[PDB]
Amino acid sequence: SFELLHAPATVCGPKKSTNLVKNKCVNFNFNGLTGTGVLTKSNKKFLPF
């Protein structure tokens, strides 16, 4: 017996991967954010959050 109340589908299920690439034009999905472009390593300092 499933159900979809007001709040989310939490229980939900598994999302998978693929491979990085880097230095090549690649279509793009990164945990939700989609795009297209060369993805080289950076030099930024994102806060751990």
Binding site: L5, H6, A7, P8, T10, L47, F49
Partner: peptide, 28 residues
């Protein structure tokens, strides 16, 4: 100035319309 970094997100669904502490206690 000191900003407040996130610490959780409890994905509950209760409707809160009151509150209280359980024992200095400044509240805004």
């Amino acid at each position: 100035f000191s900003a407040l970094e996130p610490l959780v997100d409890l994905p509950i669904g209760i409707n809160i319309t009151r509150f209280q502490t359980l024992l200095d206690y400044y509240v805004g």
